[PDB]
Short mmCIF file of C-alpha atoms and ligand atoms in Angstrom, two decimals:
data_model
loop_
_atom_site.label_atom_id
_atom_site.label_comp_id
_atom_site.label_asym_id
_atom_site.label_seq_id
_atom_site.Cartn_x
_atom_site.Cartn_y
_atom_site.Cartn_z
CA UNK A 8 115.77 109.84 111.18
CA UNK A 9 115.28 113.37 112.51
CA UNK A 10 114.06 114.81 109.20
CA UNK A 11 111.72 111.81 108.78
CA UNK A 12 110.16 112.49 112.15
CA UNK A 13 109.57 116.14 111.19
CA UNK A 14 108.06 114.95 107.90
CA UNK A 15 105.85 112.43 109.63
CA UNK A 16 104.73 115.00 112.20
CA UNK A 17 103.93 117.61 109.59
CA UNK A 18 101.98 114.98 107.61
CA UNK A 19 100.00 113.83 110.63
CA UNK A 20 99.14 117.36 111.75
CA UNK A 21 98.05 118.14 108.18
CA UNK A 22 96.20 114.81 108.28
CA UNK A 23 94.27 115.69 111.43
CA UNK A 24 93.31 119.04 109.93
CA UNK A 25 92.10 117.17 106.82
CA UNK A 26 90.01 114.67 108.79
CA UNK A 27 88.53 117.63 110.66
CA UNK A 28 87.61 119.41 107.41
CA UNK A 29 86.50 116.09 105.92
CA UNK A 30 84.21 115.89 108.97
CA UNK A 31 82.23 118.98 107.83
CA UNK A 44 85.65 126.36 98.18
CA UNK A 45 85.76 124.48 101.52
CA UNK A 46 88.00 121.90 99.80
CA UNK A 47 90.42 124.54 98.54
CA UNK A 48 90.36 125.72 102.17
CA UNK A 49 91.13 122.24 103.51
CA UNK A 50 93.95 121.91 100.97
CA UNK A 51 95.34 125.40 101.74
CA UNK A 52 95.21 124.69 105.52
CA UNK A 53 96.94 121.30 105.19
CA UNK A 54 99.60 123.04 103.08
CA UNK A 55 100.06 125.89 105.56
CA UNK A 56 100.52 123.38 108.39
CA UNK A 57 103.08 121.33 106.40
CA UNK A 58 104.96 124.44 105.25
CA UNK A 59 104.96 125.82 108.78
CA UNK A 60 106.22 122.57 110.27
CA UNK A 61 108.90 121.90 107.68
CA UNK A 62 110.00 125.58 107.49
CA UNK A 63 110.36 125.73 111.26
CA UNK A 64 112.18 122.39 111.19
CA UNK A 65 114.43 123.07 108.20
CA UNK A 66 114.43 126.84 107.52
CA UNK A 67 117.02 126.72 104.75
CA UNK A 68 115.25 123.92 102.82
CA UNK A 69 113.46 124.69 99.55
CA UNK A 70 109.84 123.77 98.88
CA UNK A 71 108.03 122.42 95.88
CA UNK A 72 104.36 122.19 96.84
CA UNK A 73 101.50 121.42 94.54
CA UNK A 74 100.40 124.31 92.31
CA UNK A 75 102.45 126.86 94.29
CA UNK A 76 105.59 128.83 93.35
CA UNK A 77 108.72 126.90 94.19
CA UNK A 78 110.72 128.20 97.12
CA UNK A 79 114.47 127.93 96.56
CA UNK A 80 116.01 127.35 99.98
CA UNK A 81 119.16 128.99 101.32
CA UNK A 82 120.36 125.37 101.34
CA UNK A 83 119.89 125.05 97.58
CA UNK A 84 120.42 121.25 97.62
CA UNK A 85 117.51 120.26 99.92
CA UNK A 86 113.85 120.70 99.16
CA UNK A 87 110.63 119.24 100.43
CA UNK A 88 108.23 118.19 97.74
CA UNK A 89 104.69 118.27 98.98
CA UNK A 90 101.21 117.35 98.06
CA UNK A 91 99.22 118.54 101.06
CA UNK A 92 96.19 116.71 99.77
CA UNK A 93 96.47 113.94 97.23
CA UNK A 94 92.99 112.85 96.28
CA UNK A 95 91.33 116.28 96.31
CA UNK A 96 88.32 115.16 94.26
CA UNK A 97 87.89 112.15 96.59
CA UNK A 98 88.16 114.59 99.46
CA UNK A 99 85.59 116.99 97.91
CA UNK A 100 83.15 114.13 97.46
CA UNK A 101 83.58 112.50 100.83
CA UNK A 102 85.42 109.42 99.48
CA UNK A 103 87.66 108.39 102.39
CA UNK A 104 90.68 107.90 100.16
CA UNK A 105 93.26 110.71 100.07
CA UNK A 106 96.57 111.39 101.60
CA UNK A 107 99.31 113.77 102.47
CA UNK A 108 102.61 113.23 100.70
CA UNK A 109 105.93 114.79 101.64
CA UNK A 110 109.21 113.83 100.02
CA UNK A 111 112.63 115.18 100.84
CA UNK A 112 114.97 115.68 97.92
CA UNK A 113 118.69 116.03 98.68
CA UNK A 114 121.03 116.81 95.80
CA UNK A 115 118.41 115.96 93.24
CA UNK A 116 117.66 112.60 94.88
CA UNK A 117 114.61 111.69 96.84
CA UNK A 118 115.88 110.48 100.15
CA UNK A 119 112.80 110.32 102.33
CA UNK A 120 109.08 110.10 101.87
CA UNK A 121 105.91 109.99 103.86
CA UNK A 122 102.45 109.26 102.53
CA UNK A 123 99.78 109.48 105.19
CA UNK A 124 96.19 108.46 104.75
CA UNK A 125 94.68 110.25 107.71
CA UNK A 126 91.28 108.49 107.45
CA UNK A 127 92.59 104.97 107.75
CA UNK A 128 95.51 106.18 109.84
CA UNK A 129 97.87 104.63 107.32
CA UNK A 130 101.40 105.91 107.45
CA UNK A 131 103.78 104.92 104.66
CA UNK A 132 107.40 105.94 105.09
CA UNK A 133 110.64 105.17 103.38
CA UNK A 134 114.14 106.50 103.48
CA UNK A 135 116.70 105.75 100.88
CA UNK A 136 118.47 102.49 101.75
CA UNK A 137 116.17 101.81 104.77
CA UNK A 138 113.21 100.10 103.08
CA UNK A 139 109.57 101.13 103.16
CA UNK A 140 107.40 100.92 106.21
CA UNK A 141 103.68 100.67 106.63
CA UNK A 142 103.00 101.87 110.20
CA UNK A 143 106.42 100.89 111.57
CA UNK A 144 106.60 97.43 109.96
CA UNK A 145 108.62 96.86 106.78
CA UNK A 146 106.31 96.61 103.79
CA UNK A 147 107.16 95.11 100.45
CA UNK A 148 105.75 95.07 96.95
CA UNK A 149 103.68 92.04 96.05
CA UNK A 150 105.38 88.86 94.81
CA UNK A 151 102.92 88.26 91.95
CA UNK A 152 104.52 87.29 88.64
CA UNK A 153 101.62 87.25 86.21
CA UNK A 154 99.31 90.11 85.25
CA UNK A 155 96.48 87.60 85.24
CA UNK A 156 96.93 87.38 89.03
CA UNK A 157 97.15 91.10 89.46
CA UNK A 158 95.17 94.04 90.65
CA UNK A 159 96.50 97.06 88.86
CA UNK A 160 95.65 100.60 89.89
CA UNK A 161 95.46 103.46 87.53
CA UNK A 162 94.29 107.04 87.12
CA UNK A 163 92.83 109.01 84.21
CA UNK A 164 95.19 111.20 82.16
CA UNK A 173 95.38 105.92 73.63
CA UNK A 174 94.55 105.83 77.32
CA UNK A 175 91.58 103.68 76.33
CA UNK A 176 93.91 101.38 74.37
CA UNK A 177 96.25 101.05 77.35
CA UNK A 178 93.27 100.45 79.59
CA UNK A 179 91.91 97.83 77.18
CA UNK A 180 95.39 96.33 76.95
CA UNK A 181 95.79 95.99 80.69
CA UNK A 182 92.12 95.09 81.36
CA UNK A 183 92.55 92.09 79.01
CA UNK A 184 95.49 90.86 81.08
CA UNK A 185 94.70 91.52 84.71
CA UNK A 186 92.55 90.08 87.48
CA UNK A 187 91.30 93.61 88.17
CA UNK A 188 91.72 97.29 87.72
CA UNK A 189 91.36 99.82 90.52
CA UNK A 190 90.89 103.50 90.14
CA UNK A 191 90.98 105.02 93.60
CA UNK A 192 91.59 108.64 92.56
CA UNK A 193 94.92 109.17 94.25
CA UNK A 194 98.47 108.97 92.93
CA UNK A 195 100.58 109.01 96.04
CA UNK A 196 98.26 106.66 97.93
CA UNK A 197 98.24 104.38 94.92
CA UNK A 198 102.03 104.23 94.93
CA UNK A 199 101.99 103.53 98.71
CA UNK A 200 99.56 100.73 97.98
CA UNK A 201 101.90 99.14 95.42
CA UNK A 202 104.78 99.70 97.84
CA UNK A 203 102.75 97.96 100.59
CA UNK A 204 101.82 95.11 98.25
CA UNK A 205 98.14 96.04 98.29
CA UNK A 206 97.94 96.41 94.56
CA UNK A 207 100.40 94.76 92.22
CA UNK A 208 101.18 97.72 90.09
CA UNK A 209 100.19 101.21 89.02
CA UNK A 210 100.36 103.33 85.97
CA UNK A 211 99.21 106.84 85.27
CA UNK A 212 99.82 109.70 82.87
CA UNK A 213 100.06 113.42 83.51
CA UNK A 214 101.27 113.06 87.07
CA UNK A 215 103.06 115.92 88.83
CA UNK A 216 106.36 115.65 90.74
CA UNK A 217 104.62 116.07 94.12
CA UNK A 218 102.13 113.40 93.14
CA UNK A 219 104.94 110.94 92.78
CA UNK A 220 108.11 111.80 94.68
CA UNK A 221 107.42 110.06 98.00
CA UNK A 222 105.60 107.19 96.29
CA UNK A 223 108.42 106.41 93.93
CA UNK A 224 110.92 106.08 96.75
CA UNK A 225 108.36 104.01 98.67
CA UNK A 226 107.95 101.57 95.80
CA UNK A 227 111.71 101.32 95.18
CA UNK A 228 112.47 100.91 98.93
CA UNK A 229 109.71 98.25 99.07
CA UNK A 230 111.71 96.37 96.46
CA UNK A 231 109.62 97.44 93.50
CA UNK A 232 110.61 99.34 90.39
CA UNK A 233 109.30 102.56 88.96
CA UNK A 234 109.79 103.77 85.38
CA UNK A 235 108.10 106.27 83.10
CA UNK A 236 105.66 104.72 80.60
CA UNK A 237 108.48 104.21 78.11
CA UNK A 238 110.44 102.13 80.68
CA UNK A 239 113.09 104.79 81.46
CA UNK A 240 113.82 107.07 84.42
CA UNK A 241 112.41 110.35 83.05
CA UNK A 242 109.36 110.11 85.29
CA UNK A 243 109.26 113.74 86.49
CA UNK A 244 109.81 114.89 82.91
CA UNK A 245 107.36 112.50 81.17
CA UNK A 246 104.83 113.03 84.01
CA UNK A 247 103.98 109.35 83.80
CA UNK A 248 104.77 106.22 85.70
CA UNK A 249 104.61 102.47 85.85
CA UNK A 250 105.27 100.95 89.27
CA UNK A 251 105.21 97.44 90.59
CA UNK A 252 107.49 94.58 91.36
CA UNK A 253 110.13 93.88 88.71
CA UNK A 254 107.99 91.19 86.98
CA UNK A 255 104.72 93.08 87.01
CA UNK A 256 106.33 96.41 86.07
CA UNK A 257 107.86 94.85 82.89
CA UNK A 258 104.59 93.11 81.85
CA UNK A 259 102.63 96.28 82.54
CA UNK A 260 105.07 98.12 80.33
CA UNK A 261 104.59 95.44 77.64
CA UNK A 262 100.78 95.48 78.01
CA UNK A 263 100.62 99.28 77.85
CA UNK A 264 102.69 99.37 74.62
CA UNK A 265 100.57 96.69 72.80
CA UNK B 6 65.41 103.97 116.99
CA UNK B 7 65.85 101.29 114.29
CA UNK B 8 63.18 98.62 113.66
CA UNK B 9 63.40 95.12 115.17
CA UNK B 10 64.59 93.43 111.96
CA UNK B 11 66.96 96.33 111.13
CA UNK B 12 68.54 96.08 114.57
CA UNK B 13 69.00 92.35 113.97
CA UNK B 14 70.54 92.88 110.49
CA UNK B 15 72.84 95.63 111.81
CA UNK B 16 74.03 93.28 114.55
CA UNK B 17 74.63 90.46 112.06
CA UNK B 18 76.56 92.95 109.89
CA UNK B 19 78.53 94.41 112.83
CA UNK B 20 79.47 90.90 113.87
CA UNK B 21 80.37 89.54 110.45
CA UNK B 22 82.24 92.82 110.06
CA UNK B 23 84.25 92.53 113.27
CA UNK B 24 85.20 88.97 112.22
CA UNK B 25 86.34 89.99 108.70
CA UNK B 26 88.54 92.76 110.08
CA UNK B 27 90.13 90.14 112.35
CA UNK B 28 90.71 87.74 109.41
CA UNK B 29 92.04 90.78 107.55
CA UNK B 30 94.90 91.95 109.82
CA UNK B 44 91.82 79.67 100.67
CA UNK B 45 92.23 82.23 103.50
CA UNK B 46 89.83 84.63 101.73
CA UNK B 47 87.31 81.76 101.47
CA UNK B 48 87.42 80.94 105.19
CA UNK B 49 86.75 84.63 106.05
CA UNK B 50 83.83 84.76 103.60
CA UNK B 51 82.39 81.56 105.09
CA UNK B 52 83.01 82.77 108.67
CA UNK B 53 81.22 86.06 108.02
CA UNK B 54 78.42 84.13 106.30
CA UNK B 55 77.96 81.64 109.14
CA UNK B 56 77.95 84.54 111.64
CA UNK B 57 75.29 86.33 109.57
CA UNK B 58 73.32 83.12 108.95
CA UNK B 59 73.29 82.01 112.61
CA UNK B 60 72.54 85.55 113.74
CA UNK B 61 69.60 85.95 111.35
CA UNK B 62 68.40 82.34 111.77
CA UNK B 63 68.22 82.88 115.54
CA UNK B 64 66.29 86.10 114.88
CA UNK B 65 63.75 85.13 112.20
CA UNK B 66 63.83 81.29 111.88
CA UNK B 67 61.14 81.14 109.17
CA UNK B 68 62.85 83.55 106.74
CA UNK B 69 64.46 82.51 103.46
CA UNK B 70 68.17 82.97 102.80
CA UNK B 71 69.67 83.84 99.45
CA UNK B 72 73.40 84.08 99.97
CA UNK B 73 76.51 84.29 97.90
CA UNK B 77 69.66 78.91 98.67
CA UNK B 78 67.27 78.36 101.59
CA UNK B 79 63.49 78.74 101.26
CA UNK B 80 62.09 79.14 104.79
CA UNK B 81 58.72 78.24 106.36
CA UNK B 82 57.71 81.86 105.64
CA UNK B 83 57.72 82.04 101.84
CA UNK B 84 57.13 85.82 101.71
CA UNK B 85 60.36 86.86 103.45
CA UNK B 86 64.03 86.30 102.66
CA UNK B 87 67.40 87.74 103.60
CA UNK B 88 69.71 88.54 100.70
CA UNK B 89 73.28 88.45 101.86
CA UNK B 90 76.70 89.17 100.60
CA UNK B 91 78.79 88.28 103.63
CA UNK B 92 81.81 89.89 102.02
CA UNK B 93 81.48 92.24 99.11
CA UNK B 94 84.88 93.19 97.70
CA UNK B 95 86.62 89.82 98.01
CA UNK B 96 89.53 90.74 95.75
CA UNK B 97 90.16 93.93 97.78
CA UNK B 98 90.06 91.89 100.99
CA UNK B 99 92.59 89.39 99.59
CA UNK B 100 94.87 92.23 98.50
CA UNK B 101 94.53 94.18 101.75
CA UNK B 102 92.67 97.07 100.11
CA UNK B 103 90.50 98.41 102.92
CA UNK B 104 87.37 98.55 100.80
CA UNK B 105 84.85 95.84 101.31
CA UNK B 106 81.60 95.41 103.09
CA UNK B 107 78.95 93.09 104.33
CA UNK B 108 75.61 93.52 102.58
CA UNK B 109 72.34 92.30 104.05
CA UNK B 110 68.97 93.04 102.57
CA UNK B 111 65.53 91.95 103.67
CA UNK B 112 63.14 91.06 100.92
CA UNK B 113 59.43 90.97 101.77
CA UNK B 114 56.92 89.86 99.16
CA UNK B 115 59.38 90.46 96.31
CA UNK B 116 60.27 93.93 97.63
CA UNK B 117 63.50 94.99 99.33
CA UNK B 118 62.34 96.62 102.58
CA UNK B 119 65.47 96.76 104.69
CA UNK B 120 69.14 96.99 103.96
CA UNK B 121 72.45 97.16 105.63
CA UNK B 122 75.88 97.61 104.13
CA UNK B 123 78.72 97.69 106.51
CA UNK B 124 82.34 98.63 105.79
CA UNK B 125 84.06 97.23 108.84
CA UNK B 126 87.43 98.84 108.09
CA UNK B 127 86.20 102.47 107.98
CA UNK B 128 83.40 101.55 110.42
CA UNK B 129 80.92 102.87 107.82
CA UNK B 130 77.43 101.65 108.50
CA UNK B 131 74.80 102.20 105.86
CA UNK B 132 71.20 101.40 106.60
CA UNK B 133 67.87 101.92 105.03
CA UNK B 134 64.31 100.84 105.55
CA UNK B 135 61.41 101.40 103.20
CA UNK B 136 59.85 104.75 104.01
CA UNK B 137 62.29 105.46 106.85
CA UNK B 138 65.27 106.92 104.99
CA UNK B 139 68.84 105.87 104.29
CA UNK B 140 71.48 106.51 106.92
CA UNK B 141 75.22 106.66 107.06
CA UNK B 142 76.41 106.57 110.65
CA UNK B 143 73.24 108.21 112.04
CA UNK B 144 73.19 110.87 109.31
CA UNK B 145 70.36 110.98 106.80
CA UNK B 146 71.60 110.10 103.27
CA UNK B 147 70.72 112.19 100.28
CA UNK B 148 72.11 111.34 96.85
CA UNK B 149 74.19 114.15 95.41
CA UNK B 150 72.50 117.22 93.95
CA UNK B 151 74.85 117.27 90.94
CA UNK B 152 73.24 117.65 87.51
CA UNK B 153 76.14 118.04 85.06
CA UNK B 154 78.25 114.94 84.39
CA UNK B 155 81.27 117.29 84.13
CA UNK B 156 81.19 117.89 87.93
CA UNK B 157 80.60 114.19 88.64
CA UNK B 158 82.49 111.27 90.07
CA UNK B 159 81.00 108.06 88.79
CA UNK B 160 81.79 104.62 90.14
CA UNK B 161 81.79 101.46 87.98
CA UNK B 162 82.97 97.77 88.07
CA UNK B 163 84.51 95.33 85.53
CA UNK B 174 82.14 97.78 77.19
CA UNK B 175 85.26 99.91 76.78
CA UNK B 176 83.08 101.89 74.40
CA UNK B 177 80.71 102.57 77.30
CA UNK B 178 83.56 103.42 79.66
CA UNK B 179 84.89 105.91 77.07
CA UNK B 180 81.48 107.48 76.60
CA UNK B 181 81.09 107.96 80.33
CA UNK B 182 84.73 108.89 81.01
CA UNK B 183 84.68 111.60 78.33
CA UNK B 184 81.66 113.21 80.02
CA UNK B 185 82.58 113.04 83.73
CA UNK B 186 85.11 114.73 85.99
CA UNK B 187 86.10 111.33 87.41
CA UNK B 188 85.69 107.58 87.31
CA UNK B 189 86.27 105.44 90.39
CA UNK B 190 86.65 101.71 90.54
CA UNK B 191 86.93 100.74 94.21
CA UNK B 192 86.07 97.04 93.61
CA UNK B 193 82.92 96.77 95.79
CA UNK B 194 79.44 96.96 94.28
CA UNK B 195 77.38 97.23 97.52
CA UNK B 196 79.66 99.88 98.85
CA UNK B 197 79.46 101.70 95.55
CA UNK B 198 75.71 101.82 95.79
CA UNK B 199 75.96 102.90 99.44
CA UNK B 200 78.30 105.68 98.27
CA UNK B 201 75.81 106.74 95.59
CA UNK B 202 73.15 106.85 98.31
CA UNK B 203 75.38 108.82 100.71
CA UNK B 204 76.18 111.19 97.86
CA UNK B 205 79.87 110.31 97.95
CA UNK B 206 79.80 109.57 94.28
CA UNK B 207 77.29 110.95 91.81
CA UNK B 208 76.34 107.66 90.23
CA UNK B 209 77.23 104.09 89.54
CA UNK B 210 76.83 101.54 86.80
CA UNK B 211 77.90 97.93 86.51
CA UNK B 212 77.25 94.83 84.39
CA UNK B 213 76.81 91.25 85.50
CA UNK B 214 76.00 92.07 89.12
CA UNK B 215 74.29 89.68 91.52
CA UNK B 216 71.11 90.18 93.52
CA UNK B 217 73.06 90.07 96.83
CA UNK B 218 75.45 92.68 95.48
CA UNK B 219 72.64 95.07 94.75
CA UNK B 220 69.73 94.33 97.07
CA UNK B 221 70.51 96.58 100.06
CA UNK B 222 72.20 99.18 97.87
CA UNK B 223 69.24 99.73 95.61
CA UNK B 224 67.04 100.54 98.59
CA UNK B 225 69.61 102.98 100.02
CA UNK B 226 69.87 104.89 96.75
CA UNK B 227 66.04 104.90 96.46
CA UNK B 228 65.69 105.99 100.12
CA UNK B 229 68.37 108.61 99.51
CA UNK B 230 66.31 110.01 96.67
CA UNK B 231 68.12 108.49 93.71
CA UNK B 232 66.87 106.00 91.15
CA UNK B 233 67.96 102.67 89.94
CA UNK B 234 67.43 101.15 86.52
CA UNK B 235 69.00 98.43 84.46
CA UNK B 236 71.41 99.71 81.81
CA UNK B 237 68.57 99.84 79.25
CA UNK B 238 66.68 102.20 81.62
CA UNK B 239 64.04 99.67 82.68
CA UNK B 240 63.23 97.91 85.93
CA UNK B 241 64.62 94.39 85.26
CA UNK B 242 67.86 94.90 87.31
CA UNK B 243 67.96 91.44 88.93
CA UNK B 244 67.23 89.69 85.62
CA UNK B 245 69.54 91.92 83.54
CA UNK B 246 72.07 91.71 86.45
CA UNK B 247 73.05 95.25 85.53
CA UNK B 248 72.38 98.68 86.90
CA UNK B 249 72.67 102.39 86.71
CA UNK B 250 72.21 104.21 90.00
CA UNK B 251 72.08 107.84 90.93
CA UNK B 252 70.00 110.94 91.20
CA UNK B 253 67.82 110.96 88.13
CA UNK B 254 69.65 113.79 86.37
CA UNK B 255 72.88 111.87 86.64
CA UNK B 256 71.28 108.46 85.99
CA UNK B 257 69.61 109.54 82.71
CA UNK B 258 72.92 111.14 81.59
CA UNK B 259 74.67 107.84 82.34
CA UNK B 260 71.93 105.97 80.48
CA UNK B 261 72.48 108.27 77.52
CA UNK B 262 76.26 107.89 77.70
CA UNK B 263 76.03 104.07 77.87
CA UNK B 264 73.73 103.99 74.80
CA UNK B 265 75.82 106.15 72.39
MG1 LIG C 1 96.87 117.68 95.90
MG1 LIG C 2 80.76 88.41 98.49
#
C-alpha cells in the first residue's frame, strides 16, 4: 500500500542514518536525526497526518483521524553501547486503530511489515508466530520494567529467556516466530504500536498483563501465539 | 598480519560460519556437526598433532589443543535469532594463547592472541571504561537473588543466549560485563583471552581463578567486575 511504502522508506532512510551513526550525546544525536528523517518523510508524504513520536509533543494533524506513531530508535541503550540490536518502528493509526506497521532493524537489514488484514511480512515473505504449545519448549523475551516473581515464574517454565533490550524488535521477533512470546512492563505506545499489529497479523495475540486490551493504558504487554500467550499470562500471575 | 595459527583458526571459523548461515536460512544438530567437522578437518589439516576438545582427542603433541564450540547459541540458531557464533581457542601448555569468535550472521569476527591484542573486525578491542554499575549494561545467561542484586544496580541486563559472544562483547566494550554459571571450557576459552587482551579481567563468581573448574565466570573491566562480584555475593 502507498502509505506502507512511505513508512518503509522513511524507516529505511532513518535506518541508514542509524547504521552510519552506529558506525562512529552522539546517541541523542543519532536518535534526533533518525526522528527528523522520519518526520520529514512522513510529513512530506502525509502533511495532514498527526504524529506521536517518542518523548516529543504530539502533533495533532489537520486530518485528526490519522497519526503516525514513531519510535525513531527502539533499543537506544543497545545503540549507545554498540549492541547491533535496535530498530525503527513506525505505525499508522487510522480512527484509533493501528492499520499499518513497520519495524526495521537496519543492522541485520530486517524489515517487518504488517497491514491490518494483510498478514505480517518479514522481508516480503509472510511471517507467522511460532506454533509452540508448551512454555517448556519456548524462548520468551522480556524487558526490565514483582518483576522478579514474574521472571522466576516464567524462568521455571520456559526453555529460555531472552532480554535483547528492544520492545518493537522483540514484538517483530514474536511475530516472525523467532521467539515464542514476549512480556514487558512500562512500555510506551510507540514502543508497541507497530509490533502489536505485527504479532496479531502474524496470527498471534497481544494483551496487557491482565489479559485484556488496555495495552496502551496499562503500558504492559504479553504477546505470543494463542497457546503461549495464555500460559505466559498464567505463569506471570502465579 | 595475523599469526600462522590465528590465520588457520580464522579460516576454520569463517568456513564453519559460512556453513551455519547456509543451514540457517535434528536440523540444529546436523548444522552443529557440519560446522564441527569443517572446523575439525580444517584444523586437523593445519596442525595434525594438536589436541581437540570440542562440544575428546589428545594429539601427538600433548602441549597443544584446540578448544572449540562449533556453534555457540544453539537455541538462538534453532529459533532463528541471529545471535550465535563459532568459538575456537588455542590452548598451549595449559594457557589460552589464541582465540577466535565469529558471528557469521553479523559478520563479526573477534580475534585475540596473547600479547597481540583483541580485535573486532580489524579494530583494537578495549573493554568499556565504565566504572559505575548504574551506567552499565551487563550480560548474563541462565540465582534469582543474584540477578536481583545485579539488576537493581545496573542500567541494563541483556540475555542474548550466547556465552562466547557475550565475552567477545565484553572485550569489544559492547557490554560492560558478563557473568554466568555452569559454563563450559569451550564456551569461555577464546572469550576469556579477548577480555584479558582487551584489558578486562576474568574470575570465577567467587573472585578466584578456578573458572574452568567452577564452570562460572565474571568478566569485565576490573571496576565493573569487582562490583559484579560484590553484587553476586550480597
Ligand atoms: Mg526510542
Ligand atoms: Mg555449541
